[PDB]
Structures are given as C-alpha cells and as structure tokens.
Amino acid sequence: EPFSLSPIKDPQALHKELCSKNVIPVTSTLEDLLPATQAQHVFIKRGTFHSYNWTIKGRSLNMDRLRETCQSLVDRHSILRTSFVEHEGHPIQLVLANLDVKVREVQCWPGEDPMEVCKALWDGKDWPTLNVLGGSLPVRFTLVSCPGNEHVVLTIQISHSQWDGVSIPKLFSDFAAIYNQTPLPPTSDFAHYLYHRVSSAREDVQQDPTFQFWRHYLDGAKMAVPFAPGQTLWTFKGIVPPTLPSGITMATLVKAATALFLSYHLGSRDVVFGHTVNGRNLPMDNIESLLGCTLNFVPLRVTFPEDSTDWTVMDLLHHTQTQYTRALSHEHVELRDIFQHSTNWPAETPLSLIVQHQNIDLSFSLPLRGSSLDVQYSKFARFDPLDEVWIFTEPHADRLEVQVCANSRVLGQEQATELANNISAIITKFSTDPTARLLDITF
Numbered sequence: 001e002p003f004s005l006s007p008i009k010d011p012q013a014l015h016k017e018l019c020s021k022n023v024i025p026v027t028s029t030l031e032d033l034l035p036a037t038q039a040q041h042v043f044i045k046r047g048t049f050h051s052y053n054w055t056i057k058g059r060s061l062n063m064d065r066l067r068e069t070c071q072s073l074v075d076r077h078s079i080l081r082t083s084f085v086e087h088e089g090h091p092i093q094l095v096l097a098n099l100d101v102k103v104r105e106v107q108c109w110p111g112e113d114p115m116e117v118c119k120a121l122w123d124g125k126d127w128p129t130l131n132v133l134g135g136s137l138p139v140r141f142t143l144v145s146c147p148g149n150e151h152v153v154l155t156i157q158i159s160h161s162q163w164d165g166v167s168i169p170k171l172f173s174d175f176a177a178i179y180n181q182t183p184l185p186p187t188s189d190f191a192h193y194l195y196h197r198v199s200s201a202r203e204d205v206q207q208d209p210t211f212q213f214w215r216h217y218l219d220g221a222k223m224a225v226p227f228a229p230g231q232t233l234w235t236f237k238g239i240v241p242p243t244l245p246s247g248i249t250m251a252t253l254v255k256a257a258t259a260l261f262l263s264y265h266l267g268s269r270d271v272v273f274g275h276t277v278n279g280r281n282l283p284m285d286n287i288e289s290l291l292g293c294t295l296n297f298v299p300l301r302v303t304f305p306e307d308s309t310d311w312t313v314m315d316l317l318h319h320t321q322t323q324y325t326r327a328l329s330h331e332h333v334e335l336r337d338i339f340q341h342s343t344n345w346p347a348e349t350p351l352s353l354i355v356q357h358q359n360i361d362l363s364f365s366l367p368l369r370g371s372s373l374d375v376q377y378s379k380f381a382r383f384d385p386l387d388e389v390w391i392f393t394e395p396h397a398d399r400l401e402v403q404v405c406a407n408s409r410v411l412g413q414e415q416a417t418e419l420a421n422n423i424s425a426i427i428t429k430f431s432t433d434p435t436a437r438l439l440d441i442t443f
Contacts, residue, residue, distance in 0.1 A: 005198060006033040007092060014085075015094060023135040024083055028096045034194050036084060036091035038334045039279075039295050040161035044084065044091065044132050048160035051122055051380040052172075052364075055115060056152045060370025062179075063149055069179040070141045071101040076174060078189040079162045079292045080139040084132050091133060093161075095191055099137075106144040114144040114153040115378075122380050130382070132159050160293060160383075162190075165360030166278055167291045172366050180369045188285055190292030196284045197332055205341045210330040214342035217327065221301055223272040223345070224262070226352050230409035232384045237420035238399035242431035248317045250400070251357035254393045256313075256320040257426035258355050259302035260441065269304040274351030274388075275324075277331040297354055298331055298338065300324065304438070311438045313430050351388060358394045385410070391423060400427070 003011055015030035036044070074080045083094040106117055121142070132138050138159035145152045156171075163171065177184055202208040242253055255275060262271040279294035280287050302320055305311055340347040364377045385406050392403040402424045404416045411419065425443045429436075 002032045005035060005194065007035060008033055008087065011094070018083070018085070018094070018135050024094075024096060024137065025100060027098060027100065029098045030094060031078065031097040032095040032191050034093050034095070034191055036093050036161065037194070037293070038336055039297060040084075040093070040293055041091050042297065043160035043293065046386065047127075047130060047382050047384050049127055049130055049132075049138070049382045050158055050160065050163075051118070051126070052156045052158070052168075053115070053118060053378045053380065054154045054366050055376040055378065056154060056368065057150065057374045057376075058370055058372035059150055060373045061149060061152060061368075062370075063143075063145070063152075065179055066143065066152075066154065067103055069175055070103055072178045073171070073175050074099060074101045074139065076178075076184070076187070077171070077291045078191060080158075080171075081137065082139075082162065082190075083135045083137050084159075084161065085135045086133045094135075095189075096137070101141065104140065104142045106142070108144065108146055110147050112146075114146060114151060117144050118142065118153050118155055119380070126157065127380075127382050132161070138162065162293060163291065164278070164293045164295045165358060166280060166294070167289065169361050169364060170289050170291055172364055176365075176367050180367075188287075188290040190290060190294075193282070193284065193287070193290060193292060193294055196282060200282070201333075208341075210333055211338070211341040213327070213330045214333075214338045217301060218272070218299065218338075218343050221270060221272050221299075221343075223299070223349075224266050224268070224352075226387075226410075229387060230407045233404075233406060233408050233411070233413060233416055235404040235413070235416040235420050237402045237417075237424045239402070239424045239428050241395065241397070241400050242427055244431075245314060245317060245434045248321060249359075250393070250395055251359060252317055252321040252324070253427055253430060254357050254391075254402075254423075255300060255324070255355055256302070256316050257423055257430060258353075258391065259300075259320060260316065260426055260438070261422055261443070262353075263302075263304055264443075269306070270301070271303075272299050272301045274298065274354040275300045276354060276356035277324075277327075279332050281328045282332055294332075296331055296333075296335070297351055298327065298335060299351070300355070307439060313434045313436050313438065313441070316438060317430070317434065350386075353389050353391070355391045356393070358392060362394060362396060389419075391419075400424075402427070 011033040018024045019026045078095045081096045081099045140157050142155040274297050277296050279296045336347045339345045339349050366375045390405040394401045402420050404420045
C-alpha cells in the first residue's frame, strides 16, 4: 500500500511544495513516498552521477522513436521517475507519476562533434551544479545531432541511487526493446523491493532471524578503526587473471587476500571489513531484473585460527567464502540496523574499507534495429569517497584489475599504489600455490 512507509505525515503537501518551487513538473502526481536506503544515501553523499552515452551512426535512425522510447522507459521503471529530498535530515524518495519526459536536444553546427558538445555540457554545468537532494529528477535525457541526423549521441544521466551493476544492463536492453517495438514482460520496481524487505522483517527485532544471525556472526568481533586522516584518487594495478581453485570464486580470492593483508598490518587474527553484496537474494518476483540500487555494504568477518592449526591458503579461501555465504538470506538489511540491533557498536559506525568485486557486465550494448545502424557505448562518471577506502576488482579477459579509490587525505598516492600492489601480489600468490601454509606467505 502506497505511503505506508512514508516518514511524512502529509506527502501530497510536500509534492505541491516542490511543484510550486518549480523543482518538479506541475502536472506530475505523487505515486509514493518512501525512505531512501542507507546504500542509496551512500551514493548520493558521494555525488555518484553517470552519463551513459550512446553514439549512433547510420541512415536508419528514427529520431521520433528514439524520443518516445525515453518516455516509455521512464513510464516502465518508477525509480527513473523518482525525486530525492531530505527530511528531518535524512533522505526520502518521491515516486512521481504522470511524468512527461522532455529531452534536451542539440542540433550542432556542421563539423561540430556531438560528443564534444556533450562533454562541454557535462563539465560546464551538468555535474558541477548537481544537487540530488534538492529534488530535481536526476534521470534526464540529451540528444545531440549532426545536421544529417546520421551521427547522433544519446545520453542518459542518472544517480547511482537509481541503478546497480546487476540491473543497469536491463535499463539498456529495455530501451532497445522498446525502440525495436518488442513487447516486454511486466516487472517490479524498486519501491516493491523496499516493501518486501519490510514485510519479511519481524515487528519485534529480538525475534528477527536476520538480526539474530548478525548478532551471532559478529559476536566477539572488534572492527579496526583508522586513525584520523584533498582529491579523489584512483589507483590501478593489473595482474594475470587468477586461476581459481575448484569451488572458490574470484570474489573470495580478493576478499581473502584483503583479510590476510589486514591480519598482518593489524596484528590480528579476527578482522572485520566492509564488502559489497548485490542484495538480490530476497525471494520476490523479478528480483533478478527490477531496476534500482539494491547493493548493500555489510560487514565481512574473517577469523584465523592459532598458528598450531597451520591453515593453508585453501583453508582461508573456504572460510572466507562461507563467511559470505552464511549471510546471503540476511544481507539485505540496513547497516545501521545491523549495528543498532545486533551489536553494541554505535549505529552510525562507518565501514572504513569496502571491497567490491565486480562480477557483473563490464561491457554494454544498445542493439537498435536498422539496416545501417552502429551504436557505440561510452560514459562520463563522478564519484567522490568520504573517509573510506574502496577496493574494486574488475575481472577482464586479459587482466584482473585491482582498483583503489580514496581521497588523497585518507590515502596518499604512494600509499594507494602500495595498497594496490600488495593486494594484487597476495591474490597472485594465493592463486599460484593454494596449498601453501599461511605462515609461509610473505608480501
């Protein structure tokens, strides 16, 4: 039932207020109002904002159909017609309906490159004036054309509060299908994910198997805390794609390497750090395909035995993997709720290190139908960490790329290079000799 999770006594008054301030269209209606998730808020606070860019070349392009497909795409997915604002200091999402999609359109001078126009608008105003919590719809479309309309760039702007690695290819395949006039099966939206989470929660938190699980999982844990800490720095290190032992995933290999790294530097046999889970293990219709950000950042605990047990790399890999798989049915709840209900830690305790293995599409396509129609993908992206360090790993065909992303005040360039180097060295060492004794590992 709509508005059943609204923290606002009167949602319609808020919508009317936004319309009268010319923030959202006056003819829109308010379909729902829900809290934004902690993960959505993570991305918003970090200015996480993308332009997904499609360069379309050929004589077959139908500009009117392209335009109407933008409208139909937004009709289909309510997350794309969502507006975000803050109240009582914490973020809510307003799902709009009766929303007219208006495309920003540019007809270029002869010889003027459409992508260069897109880049100028991006750098000159689109991301520098971004203010997602002001309520302006983050999802909006731009169409930049050369005089013959046979060289065109279509862009889709979007906040990472509105997509994730699993579902962004569905945005593109739905777009193509709508343009190609292929019917699509009905789908659920992000609001329905949120309602389903609440329906599976027990009213008495003490009786909730998920918070019982996290209390048990984290029992006796102490999470290390960085000492007090510029610009966003990305640092990359590529290695030969690791050979996986049977039954062990690439994500496990990366997270086990990170755990060993931390055990050494912290002088600890019991480490807790953050990692990204996809949040799509909830039993609900269309969980695999609904569009939105169901990502979660949750604690991963790795506990090493005493030296006498003489663990091998394989023992660590198996343990690390089950320390993830144990939590699958419980991984969808708010981090601050895990900390409030299942630990003695302050609810607003942040994760200071987050490991995210990208076991998602690394390449994208928009298969628009036409005799002569070439479509090429590219993107612009903003992302600015706060006090945390991110480690992303991308499993390409010719390399596993270890990426470190952190503010230079938190992790200086020489330090980030060393982190990426050490983590990648451990991954390769684990891969090269999975039967090695942990006590014998150096890096």
